[PDB]
Design a protein around this ligand. Sequence first.
Ligand code: CL
Ligand code: CL
Ligand code: CL
Ligand code: CL
Ligand code: NA
Lengths: 368, 369
Amino acid sequence: PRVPFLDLKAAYEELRAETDAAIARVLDSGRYLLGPELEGFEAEFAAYCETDHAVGVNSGMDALQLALRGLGIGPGDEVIVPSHTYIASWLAVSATGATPVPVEPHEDHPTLDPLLVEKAITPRTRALLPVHLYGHPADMDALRELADRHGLHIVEDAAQAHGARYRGRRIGAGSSVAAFSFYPGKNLGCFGDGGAVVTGDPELAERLRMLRNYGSRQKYSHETKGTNSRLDEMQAAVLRIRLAHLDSWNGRRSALAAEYLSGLAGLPGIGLPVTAPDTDPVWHLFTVRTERRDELRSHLDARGIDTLTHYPVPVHLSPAYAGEAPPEGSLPRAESFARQVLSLPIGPHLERPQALRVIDAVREWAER
Amino acid sequence: PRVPFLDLKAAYEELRAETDAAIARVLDSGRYLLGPELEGFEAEFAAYCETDHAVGVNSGMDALQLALRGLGIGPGDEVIVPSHTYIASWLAVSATGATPVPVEPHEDHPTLDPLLVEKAITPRTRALLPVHLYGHPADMDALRELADRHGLHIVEDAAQAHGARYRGRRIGAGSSVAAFSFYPGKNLGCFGDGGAVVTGDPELAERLRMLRNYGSRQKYSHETKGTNSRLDEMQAAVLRIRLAHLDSWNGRRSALAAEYLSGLAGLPGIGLPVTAPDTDPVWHLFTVRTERRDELRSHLDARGIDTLTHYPVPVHLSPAYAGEAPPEGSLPRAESFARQVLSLPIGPHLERPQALRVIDAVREWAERV
Ligand SMILES: [Cl-]
Ligand SMILES: [Cl-]
Ligand SMILES: [Cl-]
Ligand SMILES: [Cl-]
Ligand code: NA
């Protein structure tokens, strides 16, 4: 019996009946798109995030893209993005025609270094795109201070941070503009692709409802250009159930995280995640860093432990960004991260003893 | 009990059991994206379409857009579109960075007029985007010829034409490049958004699989830029079932169509839809034309009949484009269709009697009026 990285089936199994019923409900409704499930989810998700509006879309990527779009970002604009993140973050900027400008993470936290952000700002800069990587919130007060002083917008990539808190407030609260993914493996996931943009701005909320719907807010009418990026009634129905358990599931993750942080303490060659001050991380991913990453991975594999790497290739070095990003060596932080990082099993369906088993193996290796 | 325009619920009911099971299987599989269902559906669909490959995506708009992108179409490029079509057709083009260039349909056929294309070809023209509107195929032979002569690609908008035939061939057959929508209300629909691109080109197929998946064909690798545009396992499973009944269901629409054509014969003010020669329409929509359609619709409503208009505003006149399209009065065909069309209830769940009822009301209005 192996230790799985993240059991999707178990999420279904835990709420089988409720899940089956919601789906059955949608089926019987004869309403599959832009229905009451979506409205209910949005309402519920908005309140959860301590904000006014939730606009369900098709995926975390569109969420980011439509948010930037709705904020008027496009060609000739620069959007500061993190050098250390998942490629989609950059892709969403690219998709709008705007230019992504990478900024290195903090020396101790996998998020955007505020000090380094300021330096990257230019007259073409229009927005900051911090990513609350692995469920860890970036230094929002600092970034906001900067944004205000430079007249920039802030679109948050909260795809790995559902429910997290920064200085006691939910990610996406108030005047925030935050994008989320409901991809099956996310903290809050469904059985297909899904996403959302949360915002406290009524005009932005309106544009998003339009942009995700062929630029229309009335049948047969198309006021602006737009696309097809919606969250199905089926998925939304399921989301409503998961949402009700979100805090509890994240709680489970935190508990597991405490174990790892405690059991992995003081190990040679094992760099542990640092929780930023006044933050409540959601541990979408539990990451460790070591110079002998490949070795540790194999050892874990040998010990029957499933792992993933987030991410083996720094965005700037992916062929997808060939000829457009800084040269290797020019983003050493992202580079070192990519080569040292490993994700340990974590989830709301992973049990204490399983986590302890993982600790045994990492320990053995570190002590090897 | 009114006559519904298109009962989605009935589609579920008719296959309730199998449908239920398909979904249950997926839930239980623990695999929700890029799985067996998608692979199976793709296989089945490509075959159905008489082609080699099917690339399932999120929507018909994405399908169109990804096809164009895959063909290298973009900024600085022009794509000839029909002046009479659903806005998404132009939107797909815009989304790539290219420019949609409208060309009129035939006078009495809701498809791109091959004779007016050439005149719109420019040095930036990279493709033709014919639309098999309402389930009626556009004149493919003439279009390919023209396209071949100009070194242009052809991306067909087949969102309303699943299973139709052109000169005996399925829409999307062989070397075609055709995009479909699986939106709930389409001829082949699911319980959410869904789409697909079919092609006999192995390279384009590979590009599309990548474009729809963040430019990746392997974990951790992103060879090229890409996006997120996938057809869910749940939706794909349902679609395999529906696909199996497609021909059957389309057959029902054809019979109703024949019923309408027959009963609405001899109504001078009511323009009836024309079936081009050598085509096998799938009648996604049964459209009649008449000046005074708003009145007719009123009449039908009163008579308890639901109807729709596809479409009331021609694309060039929507605010989304107006700033960049030809002026009002310069696209008389698109304009005339927009002002005269009316869609009568049609679908695999509409019965002969209900349709008779529709005919009676139409006849009465025409007779009064
Ligand atoms: Cl619907
Ligand atoms: Cl419309
Ligand atoms: Cl999955
Ligand atoms: Cl990756
Ligand atoms: Na979807």
